[PDB]
Amino acid sequence: NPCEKHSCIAVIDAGSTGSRLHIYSYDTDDTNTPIHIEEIWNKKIKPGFASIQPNSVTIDAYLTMLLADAPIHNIPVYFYATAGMRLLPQSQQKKYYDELDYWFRQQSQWQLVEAKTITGNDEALFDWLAVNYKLDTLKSVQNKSVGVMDMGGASVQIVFPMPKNAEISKHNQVELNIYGQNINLYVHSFLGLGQTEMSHQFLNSPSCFANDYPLPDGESGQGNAPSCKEEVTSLMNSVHKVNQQIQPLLALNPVNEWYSIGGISNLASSQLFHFENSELTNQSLLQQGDNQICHQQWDILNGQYPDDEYLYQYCLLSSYYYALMVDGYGINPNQTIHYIPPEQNLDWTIGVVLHRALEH
Amino acid sequence: NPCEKHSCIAVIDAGSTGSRLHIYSYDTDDTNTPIHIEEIWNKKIKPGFASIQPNSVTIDAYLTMLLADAPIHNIPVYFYATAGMRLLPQSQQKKYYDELDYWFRQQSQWQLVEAKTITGNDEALFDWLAVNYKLDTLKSVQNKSVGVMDMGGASVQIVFPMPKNAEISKHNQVELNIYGQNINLYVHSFLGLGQTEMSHQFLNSPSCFANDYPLPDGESGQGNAPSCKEEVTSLMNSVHKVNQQIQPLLALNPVNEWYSIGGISNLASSQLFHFENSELTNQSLLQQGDNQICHQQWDILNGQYPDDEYLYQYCLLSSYYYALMVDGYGINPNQTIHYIPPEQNLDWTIGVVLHRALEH
Numbered sequence: 098n099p100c101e102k103h104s105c106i107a108v109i110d111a112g113s114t115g116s117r118l119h120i121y122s123y124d125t126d127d128t129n130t131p132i133h134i135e136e137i138w139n140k141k142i143k144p145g146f147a148s149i150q151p152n153s154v155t156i157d158a159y160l161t162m163l164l165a166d167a168p169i170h171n172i173p174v175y176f177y178a179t180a181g182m183r184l185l186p187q188s189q190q191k192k193y194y195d196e197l198d199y200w201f202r203q204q205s206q207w208q209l210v211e212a213k214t215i216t217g218n219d220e221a222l223f224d225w226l227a228v229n230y231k232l233d234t235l236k237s238v239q240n241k242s243v244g245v246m247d248m249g250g251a252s253v254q255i256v257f258p259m260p261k262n263a264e265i266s267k268h269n270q271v272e273l274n275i276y277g278q279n280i281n282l283y284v285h286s287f288l289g290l291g292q293t294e295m296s297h298q299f300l301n302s303p304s305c306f307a308n309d310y311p312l313p314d315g316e317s318g319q320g321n322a323p324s325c326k327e328e329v330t331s332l333m334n335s336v337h338k339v340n341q342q343i344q345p346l347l348a349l350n351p352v353n354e355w356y357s358i359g360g361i362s363n364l365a366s367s368q369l370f371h372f373e374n375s376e377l378t379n380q381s382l383l384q385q386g387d388n389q390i391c392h393q394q395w396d397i398l399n400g401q402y403p404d405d406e407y408l409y410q411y412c413l414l415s416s417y418y419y420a421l422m423v424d425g426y427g428i429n430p431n432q433t434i435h436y437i438p439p440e441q442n443l444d445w446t447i448g449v450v451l452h453r454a455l456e457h
Numbered sequence: 458n459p460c461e462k463h464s465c466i467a468v469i470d471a472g473s474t475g476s477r478l479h480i481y482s483y484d485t486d487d488t489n490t491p492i493h494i495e496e497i498w499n500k501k502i503k504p505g506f507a508s509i510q511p512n513s514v515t516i517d518a519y520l521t522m523l524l525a526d527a528p529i530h531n532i533p534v535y536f537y538a539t540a541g542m543r544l545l546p547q548s549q550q551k552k553y554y555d556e557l558d559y560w561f562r563q564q565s566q567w568q569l570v571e572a573k574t575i576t577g578n579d580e581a582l583f584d585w586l587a588v589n590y591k592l593d594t595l596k597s598v599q600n601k602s603v604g605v606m607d608m609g610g611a612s613v614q615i616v617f618p619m620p621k622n623a624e625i626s627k628h629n630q631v632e633l634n635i636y637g638q639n640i641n642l643y644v645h646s647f648l649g650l651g652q653t654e655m656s657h658q659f660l661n662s663p664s665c666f667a668n669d670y671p672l673p674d675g676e677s678g679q680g681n682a683p684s685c686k687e688e689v690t691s692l693m694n695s696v697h698k699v700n701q702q703i704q705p706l707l708a709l710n711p712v713n714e715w716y717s718i719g720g721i722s723n724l725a726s727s728q729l730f731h732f733e734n735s736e737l738t739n740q741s742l743l744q745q746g747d748n749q750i751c752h753q754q755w756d757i758l759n760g761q762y763p764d765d766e767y768l769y770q771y772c773l774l775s776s777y778y779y780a781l782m783v784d785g786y787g788i789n790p791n792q793t794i795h796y797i798p799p800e801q802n803l804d805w806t807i808g809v810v811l812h813r814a815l816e817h
């Protein structure tokens with residue numbers, strides 16, 4: 098039992114496409130800040146919590162499945178939901194949390210401490226903490242700016258260092274104290290621009306699917322990634338005004354190294370894309386999507402690569418990552434974007450270990 | 458039992474926000490075309506079938522709830538799913554239908570004939586048939602053009618008479634033969650432009666919510682229907698190009714009478730909006746939404762009208778309907794739009810009674 102000699106907590110990423118339970122062990126330094134954070138248990142379940150029926154039978158089955166087989170008793174649990182839950186009004190969220198609270202009161206293995214929806218700004222802070230913890234950049238003052246992007250299913254987050262700016266909403270800025278240093282961050286989360294939500298506006302766009310892919314409207318795919326990218330850019334910028342919000346800030350506060358987590362890590366490490374050193378450029382991601390997916394014959398490609406359930410979306414998703422990064426955030430197409438390998442099972446929940454407070 | 462003296466079938470509208478079972482009795486005319494169609498049972502369930510987990514336990518609970526208490530058995534069932542199902546790839550849809558087929562084969566009260574996803578053009582044809590059947594306009598050649606709009610949760614449909622054009626996709630044209638007359642219709646369905654899907658792009662727009670409504674991102678509502686409308690128009694036209702696709706065709710094929718079904722019927726007949734004769738104009742709809750919802754103090758308005766779960770969305774939804782009809786379709790703001798009263802339980806399923814063929 099690691100938890101008899103180290104602190105342990107359980108954090109659940111109740112994300113839009115699935116829930117991920119992690120039990121972390123850790124020690125603390127002389128200010129009671131966690132160090133030596135190690136994942137000692139994990140379990141994932143699909144679909145997203147906020148997609149299932151909020152009735153006792155269904156919620157019981159789902160929590161029972163997520164929380165089974167753990168070899169440690171009486172661990173405190175922090176259940177934190179993200180953008181899937183944030184699509185729902187507070188009265189509907191309440192139904193889920195009342196049922197989850199009841200479930201936890203009927204059992205004796207886990208100790209529920211908190212179950213709630215976090216804000217997108219909370220989620221972005223945790224995204225930056227998680228990646229910077231893994232990079233070992235938190236303990237000392239850095240001379241390089243690290244930006245993080247989390248490519249989720251219901252929202253996307255961008256977070257990067259920026260001094261306090263009295264002309265920007267308080268909600269898009271966080272003053273972080275961690276290991277005795279003060280870090281000021283810009284945070285933004287874009288609700289509805291996550292993969293799943295975005296994709297529901299383009300399912301009948303022939304440019305976004307392999308040739309002859311059967312679109313729901315009965316038309317055929319006719320892939321063309323630059324064209325698909327321009328369609329996604331219209332949602333990015335004509336609808337959400339990503340470019341107007343983000344690019345002036347990055348122009349004055351440039352990021353020196355970009356790291357990404359979320360679906361782009363899974364795409365870029367699939368059998369269909371080919372990148373070295375766990376990094377990509379947007380130029381190469383669009384080119385590979387266009388040649389290896391968009392302009393292929395769908396039945397031929399699907400027969401060649403039968404095991405990847407995201408295959409049919411890779412023309413759209415490569416186009417969409419480029420639209421978000423290059424046309425929305427203004428990142429140069431040749432700038433290196435590091436992505437964290439999916440096998441590391443890194444998500445924002447490491448940030449909760451380090452920093453318990455949430456926006457009030 | 459009316460089905461001992463008349464033909465009966467059951468049709469389920471498996472819509473994006475819920476399923477509606479209808480049992481219809483009818484007679485037939487000399488060509489075996491239904492007449493005297495009467496709804497003799499109705500039951501509705503939430504949420505949408507394509508939203509629940511596709512496992513036997515949950516599908517069986519859902520079907521059991523929908524098809525219980527029905528006063529009539531041993532009748533044929535047509536289960537037709539719409540845009541909620543169309544969001545999913547065929548392999549995911551198959552999991553739902555394989556489980557649904559198994560449930561039906563395991564019982565003896567209902568005879569399943571077909572369970573499938575219909576296309577948006579099929580849905581549009583059935584929308585038009587259903588409204589014109591109720592209007593008594595199918596048996597004779599009409600001297601006025603009747604247009605129909607269905608304001609759904611995952612897609613919206615428009616359908617109106619249009620002589621055959623060799624320049625338009627045959628996917629968007631249908632030649633309908635009914636009661637011995639031939640009617641040429643333009644059909645179009647816009648996937649992703651239904652209420653629920655649309656709304657996920659605007660939940661953090663302060664113009665789309667009452668003053669001080671708590672947006673998910675922590676900012677406050679600051680409602681203004683004309684400004685909310687302009688945001689939704691960017692999705693309509695910069696992303697989906699609704700105007701370019703629809704306006705030139707209506708300019709040349711004017712509709713003399715517009716009828717709408719779907720969520721606009723519910724909003725227009727709520728306690729928050731005030732229209733006579735089950736009709737509205739877009740100018741009045743936008744003005745009522747702006748002054749009765751958008752510019753109100755949220756807590757005060759919510760306290761005044763506690764019993765309508767759609768209240769918080771009415772600033773957005775009135776703005777959206779106007780953006781769709783005026784800025785998308787090109788309909789004059791001053792034009793009367795009839796809405797079918799919700800009490801009538803009219804949906805596209807009457808069209809299936811009349812016309813069994815689906816797009817091949």
Ligand SMILES: Nc1ncnc2c1ncn2[C@@H]1O[C@H](COP(=O)(O)NP(=O)(O)O)[C@@H](O)[C@H]1O
Nearest residue numbers: 112113114179249250251252292360363364407
């Ligand atoms: N192979 C793959 N290619 C691209 N995206 C992939 C993938 N495997 C998972 N994903 C995507 O990762 C995303 C993970 O996001 P989530 O954490 O589930 N959503 P949120 O609560 O952060 O908004 C999903 O969109 C999922 O579909």
Ligand SMILES: Nc1ncnc2c1ncn2[C@@H]1O[C@H](COP(=O)(O)NP(=O)(O)O)[C@@H](O)[C@H]1O
Nearest residue numbers: 472473474539609610611612652720723724767
């Ligand atoms: N009071 C109300 N105001 C506005 N919209 C209301 C409402 N009551 C139901 N609705 C809406 O009707 C629509 C009915 O659509 P569905 O038939 O569920 N969706 P689809 O399969 O046709 O795409 C939903 O968006 C639902 O939320």
Ligand SMILES: [Cl-]
Nearest residue numbers: 149150509510
């Ligand atoms: Cl479910």
Ligand SMILES: [Cl-]
Nearest residue numbers: 313314577648
């Ligand atoms: Cl469609």
Ligand SMILES: [Cl-]
Nearest residue numbers: 217288673674
């Ligand atoms: Cl948010």
Ligand SMILES: [Mg+2]
Nearest residue numbers: 112113249250
């Ligand atoms: Mg996530």
Ligand SMILES: [Mg+2]
Nearest residue numbers: 472473539609
């Ligand atoms: Mg419908």
